Nucleic acid binder design. Structure first.
Ligand SMILES: Nc1ncnc2c1ncn2[C@@H]1O[C@H](COP(=O)(O)OP(=O)(O)OP(=O)(O)O)[C@@H](O)[C@H]1O
Length: 529
RNA sequence: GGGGUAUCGCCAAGCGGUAAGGCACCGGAUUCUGAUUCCGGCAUUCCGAGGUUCGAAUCCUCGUACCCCAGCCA
């Protein structure tokens, strides 16, 4: 429960409504992100909990900023999260003939007019936050004149910016949005849905309330920057012949630590090629999080945990990571992979190898097991052999023993350097019966694997507040390693998360991996202490 | 000028009856993953000052801090 669900309960109880009908109205000017997922979980979640309906509506009122690629991808991500919309996909452009008719109704009532103040002059006449505005010299044209000039606008007789339709409200209102807001403006631009049928396009505040009213939306839920705009949402519906009046309720937006939500900024990261694309694993977009290894269920759990309030907030990345670690700790089958290898030969080992049994999940025997090859020459991680180390360090020291994961207790004996002080091969002796711990991969059976270790895209907690957010990009947000994985990962598929024991959760990147060389993205590292 | 918001490091419940829960953090048990799991600890106090009340985070003052609005963007 939250404040909006308490409102909906009061509405049903009082008998104001019998059903709830919500909507998610994204403009198709970019890809969806985790902030949009908070609005999807809210709107579609309420609709299914109350056995109501929720429409997907593309708020496509500005052609020069939108593209068909984005309507295809938004539909893809809404479904991926596990949500279904009511009836067909809706568009604000489906109501363009309807919106034009309601504009003519406002003109016939004298509550709208064609203004010819230039784009800079409308700002001059609008007043400021402390000073009231002033009436346009074209504000008092007759109904018959506004009708002729609006038809001329629709016919293409005016150049862009040379005229616009305005609501006649109050230029001295304390709400800047009620100081004669523009209803229509001219754009000689092709629309991804309606082609070149229209050269006049409606503004958001005129489009949104009428679109909600025609769809029978009961509770229109948007973010806090639209609280002022609610006054125009209600003025439009109180002045046209429409039978219902949807109510707008605002909640605070999601801000995530170490990342930007702004589609203007996300588009600059894509355009200037600082990330691979909109679905790059470092992106906060839904498709980026999917390719990183996040499950839809972990994102729905995140939205459930952060809540819906009116408080400005900034969630820590630790909260997001906790959600996917919880899911994947349960469902991801374990495997062995070494990200930074160093060779370890066991001089004491006799034969060409054997086959050891390893659990697909240490705390769940029902997930089964598999046979993994052991050998004399294995690969371990460099960080697990310390030539000299204190009592806290429980891994392989040049003096003592360690347990190999699910295999033998070996024992460091002699290291062998190269020339530049670095180690090339460790020499150990195993104990034929011994069945901390370190993970390993037999060199003879090792699959060569490319591992992509991701970190936060920015080096500061609020890159949005920076003067240049690009100059605060983390240079180590992607470090590519070449390691070795156990041979069973040959049958790994994209969109299947594995826990590489003692490293984290990884998944096959479906963009860079082949059969000749797999690529594993690191979704999230394990809890390191 | 107007619209909004203040409760733990971050997020959040609470609607006149004695400050839930999650993430993070500090312990301590068990583990062939420094993981998981378990156990326990984390707000005498709610933006501040005053008032009402037997009793106030809730009510009433008066202050303060922060967020949003001056696109022919959404
Ligand atoms: N960060 C966010 N947190 C919560 N809801 C959000 C967030 N960003 C957008 N929404 C909601 O999702 C819906 C669609 O947003 P929309 O597609 O118009 O993009 P936008 O982020 O609002 O603007 P822009 O495209 O310029 O970034 C709106 O109801 C909006 O309030």
């Amino acid at each position: 429960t939250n404040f909006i669900r308490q409102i909906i309960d009061e509405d049903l109880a009082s008998g104001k409504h019998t059903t709830v009908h919500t909507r998610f109205p994204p403009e198709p000017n970019g890809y969806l992100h985790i902030g949009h997922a908070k609005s999807i979980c809210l709107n579609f979640g309420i609709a299914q909990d109350y056995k109501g309906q929720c429409n997907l509506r593309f708020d496509d009122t500005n052609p020069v900023k939108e593209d068909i690629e984005y309507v295809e991808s938004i539909k893809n991500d809404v479904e991926w999260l596990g949500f279904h919309w009511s009836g067909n996909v809706r568009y604000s452009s489906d109501y363009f003939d309807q919106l034009h008719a309601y504009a003519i109704e406002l003109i016939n009532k004298g509550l709208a007019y064609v203004d010819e103040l230039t784009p800079e002059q409308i700002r001059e006449y609008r007043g400021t936050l402390t000073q009231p505005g002033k009436n346009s010299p074209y504000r008092d044209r007759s109904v018959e004149e506004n009708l002729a000039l609006f038809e001329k606008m629709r016919a293409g007789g005016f150049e862009e910016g040379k005229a616009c339709l305005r609501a006649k409200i109050d230029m001295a209102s304390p709400f800047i949005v009620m100081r004669d807001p523009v209803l229509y403006r001219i754009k000689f631009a092709e629309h991804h849905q309606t082609g070149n049928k229209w050269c006049i396009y409606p503004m958001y505040d005129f489009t949104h309330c009428i679109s909600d009213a025609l769809e029978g939306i009961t509770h229109s839920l948007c973010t806090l920057e639209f609280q002022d705009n609610r006054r125009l949402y209600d003025w439009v519906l109180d002045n046209i012949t429409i039978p219902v009046h949807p109510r707008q309720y605002e909640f605070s937006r999601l801000n995530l630590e170490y990342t930007v939500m702004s589609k203007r900024k996300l588009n600059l990261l894509v355009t200037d090629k600082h990330v691979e694309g909109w679905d790059d694993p470092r992106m906060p977009t839904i498709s980026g999080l999917r390719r990183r290894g996040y499950t839809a269920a972990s994102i729905r759990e995140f939205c459930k945990r952060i809540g819906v309030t009116k408080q400005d907030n900034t969630i820590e990345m630790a909260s997001l990571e906790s959600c996917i670690r919880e899911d994947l700790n349960e469902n991801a089958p374990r495997a062995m992979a070494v990200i930074d290898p160093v060779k370890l030969v066991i001089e004491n080992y006799q034969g060409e190898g054997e086959m050891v049994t390893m659990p697909n999940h240490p705390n769940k025997p029902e997930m089964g097991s598999r046979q993994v090859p052991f050998s004399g020459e294995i690969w371990i991680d460099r960080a697990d052999f310390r030539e000299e180390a204190n009592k806290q360090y429980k891994r392989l020291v040049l003096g003592k023993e360690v347990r190999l994961r699910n295999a033998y207790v070996i024992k460091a004996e002699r290291v062998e350097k190269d020339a530049e002080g670095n180690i090339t091969t460790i020499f150990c002796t195993y104990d034929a019966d011994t069945l901390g711990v370190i993970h390993w991969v037999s060199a003879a059976h090792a699959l060569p694997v490319e591992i992509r270790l991701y970190d936060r895209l920015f080096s500061v907690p609020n890159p949005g507040a920076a003067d240049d957010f690009l100059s605060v990009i983390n240079p180590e947000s992607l470090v590519i390693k070449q390691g070795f994985a156990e041979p069973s990962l040959k049958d790994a598929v994209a969109g299947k998360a594995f826990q590489f024991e003692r490293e984290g959760y990884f998944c096959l990147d479906s963009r860079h991996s082949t059969a000749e060389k797999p690529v594993f993205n690191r979704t999230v590292g394990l809890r390191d202490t």
